[PDB]
């Protein structure tokens, strides 16, 4: 932790406090209005810098619809490579039941509900997951494991 | 079917035409009586009993007549933005039934309004009957429904002592009739 002197300490004896002599420190006119205003008239050049040309889209307008969140699954996927790390830790503590001669993990008790295919699987694994991507099923099956799709 | 079920027929479709003939004469008298009048018996007996009326000493049934329609919204007489200048169609968040109960309560100071119900309509007026109870009357005070309005106190030493005794006797009974089954 480092501590620094407040700017007011430096500004004593400076008449203007960093606001200049010409364009001094005034009220909301010095901001071009109160709040997030002006973006279509005098701050339109700020919209053109950051937003879509022609439409100024993110600043103004509508695009698409929202699928209602109360009827949409909130996904918590895990990659195959990250899963391989997880089972290694789980095995050391003894949380893995090697039920069938192979390590058995089920994603839902681990807090995940989908399996993705990034990374590498280095052990044969039985994975109980509601959803698994195409490469996840292949990579798990290439290591001697298997994906089992449960029904929500 | 109680007689009260049959009494309700005059405010249903089967009896409306006969009831509506009767009210055309009755309302002539009610338009000339005082705006708030105490009546011996409720006009809709089955409805009054559902709302807590009983013919005990200290139960007051009052008939209230008031002018229907929207409340007397005033046109503002100083500067307003246009949204705040309208008059027609603007009503109160109070119903006329609540207004009737409040006016009845002013005529019977110290009494508590229990409930009210609609009786009749005419072109200008609406008629309600309001049930009021005197919380100072011994008959009223001990009534199981009216005590909720008039107040009720049971000492903690009474309920707690009774509950502690019941718990102690239950444990002894369950020792004989339940402990073997639990351990079996």
């Amino acid at each position: 932790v480092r501590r620094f002197k407040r700017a007011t300490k430096y500004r004593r004896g400076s008449r203007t406090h960093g606001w200049g002599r010409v364009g001094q420190h005034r009220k909301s006119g010095g901001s071009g209005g109160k709040g997030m205003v002006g973006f279509h008239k005098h701050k339109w050049s700020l919209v053109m810098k950051y937003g879509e040309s022609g439409t100024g889209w993110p600043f103004y307008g509508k695009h698409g619809f929202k699928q209602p969140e109360t009827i949409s699954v909130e996904w918590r996927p895990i990659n195959v490579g990250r899963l391989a790390e997880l089972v290694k830790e789980l095995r050391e503590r003894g949380e893995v039941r090697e039920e069938e001669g192979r390590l058995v993990v089920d994603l839902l008790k681990l807090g995940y509900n989908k399996l993705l295919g990034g990374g590498h699987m280095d052990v044969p694994l039985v994975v109980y997951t509601p959803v698994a991507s195409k490469a996840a099923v292949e990579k798990i099956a290439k290591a001697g494991g298997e994906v089992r799709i449960v029904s929500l | 079917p109680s007689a009260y079920q049959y009494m309700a027929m005059w405010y249903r479709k089967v009896g409306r035409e006969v009831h509506e003939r009767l009210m055309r004469s009755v309302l002539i008298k009610w338009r000339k009586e005082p705006a708030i009048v105490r009546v011996e018996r409720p006009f809709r007996l089955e409805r009054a009993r559902k709302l807590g009326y009983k013919p005990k000493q200290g139960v007051v049934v009052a008939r209230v007549r008031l002018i229907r329609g929207p409340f007397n919204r005033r046109r503002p007489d100083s500067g307003r933005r246009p949204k705040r200048m309208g008059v027609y169609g603007i009503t109160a968040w109070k119903s006329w039934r609540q207004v009737a109960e409040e006016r009845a309560a002013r005529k019977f100071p110290g009494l508590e309004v229990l409930n009210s119900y609609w009786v009749a309509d005419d072109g200008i007026y609406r008629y309600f009957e309001v049930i009021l109870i005197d919380c100072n009357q011994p008959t009223i005070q001990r009534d199981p429904l009216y005590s909720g309005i008039c107040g009720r106190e049971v000492p903690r030493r009474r309920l707690a002592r009774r509950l502690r005794e019941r718990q102690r006797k239950l444990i002894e009974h369950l020792k004989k009739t339940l402990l073997p089954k639990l351990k079996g």
Binding site: - | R81, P82, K83, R84, M85, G86, I90
Partner: protein, 91 residues
């Protein structure tokens, strides 16, 4: 300007050139169930000033000429603009 009533035009659906009948574009009727119309009628209720802007000064002399080209083989419709000029005469 005069314009033909029938032209030979590329049809994207047929993936070939076919004869197309030509007609003026006519805007459809605003339907009261359109979401913007539902919102407007809601906004129009109650007291207040007129709630929305309404243009008073107009500057265009002519509108853009819009023509509907209907494929005579499959019915595919291409609506194209010929630019801002006076109404064409379909010949």
């Amino acid at each position: 300007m005069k314009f033909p009533k029938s032209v030979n035009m590329y049809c994207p659906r047929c993936n070939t050139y076919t004869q197309h009948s030509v007609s003026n574009y006519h805007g459809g009727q605003r339907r009261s169930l359109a979401e913007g119309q539902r919102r407007y009628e809601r906004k129009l209720k109650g007291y207040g000033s007129t709630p929305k802007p309404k243009q008073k000064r107009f500057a265009k002399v002519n509108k853009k000429v819009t023509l509907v080209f209907t494929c005579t083989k499959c019915g595919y419709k291409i609506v194209k603009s010929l630019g801002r000029m006076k109404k064409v005469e379909l010949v």
